Amino acid sequence: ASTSQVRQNYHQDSEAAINRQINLELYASYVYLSMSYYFDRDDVALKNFAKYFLHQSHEEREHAEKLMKLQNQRGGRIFLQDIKKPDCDDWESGLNAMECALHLEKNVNQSLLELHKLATDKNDPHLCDFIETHYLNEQVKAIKELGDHVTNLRKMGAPESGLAEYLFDKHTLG
Template sequence: MVAQLHEYTKKQRGCPALPAALFDHGGEPRGSYRGPRGFAFTLAFTPATLPVPSAMLPAPPSQVRQSYHPDCEAAINSHFNLEFHASSVCLAAAVYLYRYDVALKHFSWFFVRRSLEHSGWARRLMRLQNQRGSRIRFQDIGRPVSIEWKSGLKAMKCTLFLEKFVNRSLRHLHQLAIDKSDPHLHRFLATHYSSQQVAFISELEGHVTTLSMMGAPDVDLAGSLFEKLTLGDSDKKN
């Protein structure tokens, strides 16, 4: 059974919490996340309408489908929609940070690249669904609730919060592939996906720590120096 994702509307100091759970085998939510202080941020799409496998609309059987558990199929569908949402949040942050009255160009390109990575992974997962003979199910993504982050540090904290949520969904997919004896799915995730997600979270945590130690966001110069010396060098390499 694939549990429905729940979207919490109760605000924590101006920050709506993300959904409390992804899926688990008993169909009940477990665990919770709380957003960083001062962010008006929530998951914009509402995947609560995602039916469990037994309630899916009838579809003609695929001739290429073989040994693909319905729970794995539904979980992949939900995760690529989450990737699209993460892409839209990163793109919104990039647009805000590029504004003339914010003028953090290197921060902006940092989030543009991450937005493209998220949408790229969503496309790869959809391609995987086609290869396995699955039926792709799109959900309403919606616009990001927050479109202003006030500083590069706050945008990174917000993104770190979201990336950990994406990583939790990914860990669930890994475990589901093991539990349902799907070596192809497990190998795909382990080889092409997990290490990149963990590496980015580590990089993001390092940036947040460095900015905080420099006094951002209270010290305006700290964010500007970090942008030019750290993110600027990264842009040159890319």
């Protein structure tokens, strides 16, 4: 029940919301790791899908670490939960994995916008600027890129066309 010497204008609800955001960023990292190694399978074998999702996985881990840094910067206390296994074992195709990534990045975005509404209600301009600076445009860019990718795969004839996924792997992701 004693307070951080650095803590100023940092609401307990914001502190809680940051810890929930940290768990969601580590979850995203885990989903992207899972997708990566699906495409490394001998019966899928799209090495540039695998490389693309592994890079996304490492990105999500940096998102988590920056939130852990912020928690400490503001004098909050990190509280960790189980990282849940990803919601798909089989991802069936390039298109389907990109579709799942798009839904994930939209879920992560919806959580960040909720976090921003809270920071606004608690009048925390530093936490607002942090979220705007480091997260909101990264999400908008990521969602747009996955949108683009999903559209290319669909137009090329995925997931029926194994040729479309092969060529997309070489031209877009290579």
